[PDB]
Amino acid sequence: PQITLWKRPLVTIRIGGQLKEALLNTGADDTVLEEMNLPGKWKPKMIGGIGGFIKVRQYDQIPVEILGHKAIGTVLVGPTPVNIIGRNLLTQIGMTLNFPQITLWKRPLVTIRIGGQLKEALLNTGADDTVLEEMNLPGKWKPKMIGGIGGFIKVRQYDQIPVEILGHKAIGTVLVGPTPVNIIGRNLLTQIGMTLNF
Amino acid sequence: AETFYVD
């Protein structure tokens, strides 16, 4: 099947007798769930994103069911604002990004062109918006706040900015601020005709 | 307005 990116790519996942809505997240290395008391050994781990780090528990070898597919791997548990299916499990169920085909064993980093500049950015189905590391862009910007795994940040919102992504042209909203990596979000992914497929 | 991505 093919999942478009017009809205958040949410799917039901099953873990034991517990069913959860979770975000299919190409911008996450790891799979991170809210509230649950899985059996067995775990270790503490710190995971980071847009507004800092959170502490989680790492459970290994946990079988999940995603979209009728059987997966088994590491599941992190902690105070994530949304449940997140990461690349560790996305690869096992055969999920790719497609327009050419990008598999998810590595971070889906591509080269983008913005204002004559070449930068590396992450194709992120788990991002509503496109957020770039601090840079100068032209035009009147609007102050804005956004959130991620570790909380909220101030960003600057530029509208109708041209961005060439893997040679595909988009023109849309680009937020600039203290993101850990450049992030191409769904607003631009839809513009270049990207989908999740499995 | 939410941007997950976990390191």
UniProtKB/Swiss-Prot annotation, chain A:
<feature type="domain" description="Peptidase A2">
    <location>
        <begin position="20"/>
        <end position="188"/>
    </location>
</feature>
<feature type="region of interest" description="Dimerization of protease">
    <location>
        <begin position="49"/>
        <end position="154"/>
    </location>
</feature>
<feature type="region of interest" description="Dimerization of protease">
    <location>
        <begin position="88"/>
        <end position="198"/>
    </location>
</feature>
<feature type="region of interest" description="Dimerization of protease">
    <location>
        <begin position="1"/>
        <end position="104"/>
    </location>
</feature>
<comment type="function">
    <text>Aspartyl protease that mediates proteolytic cleavages of Gag and Gag-Pol polyproteins during or shortly after the release of the virion from the plasma membrane. Cleavages take place as an ordered, step-wise cascade to yield mature proteins. This process is called maturation. Displays maximal activity during the budding process just prior to particle release from the cell. Also cleaves Nef and Vif, probably concomitantly with viral structural proteins on maturation of virus particles. Hydrolyzes host EIF4GI and PABP1 in order to shut off the capped cellular mRNA translation.</text>
</comment>
<protein>
    <recommendedName>
        <fullName>Protease</fullName>
    </recommendedName>
</protein>
<feature type="site" description="Cleavage; by viral protease">
    <location>
        <begin position="1"/>
        <end position="100"/>
    </location>
</feature>
<feature type="active site" description="For protease activity; shared with dimeric partner">
    <location>
        <begin position="25"/>
        <end position="124"/>
    </location>
</feature>
<comment type="subunit">
    <text>Homodimer, whose active site consists of two apposed aspartic acid residues.</text>
</comment>
<feature type="site" description="Cleavage; by viral protease">
    <location>
        <begin position="99"/>
        <end position="198"/>
    </location>
</feature>
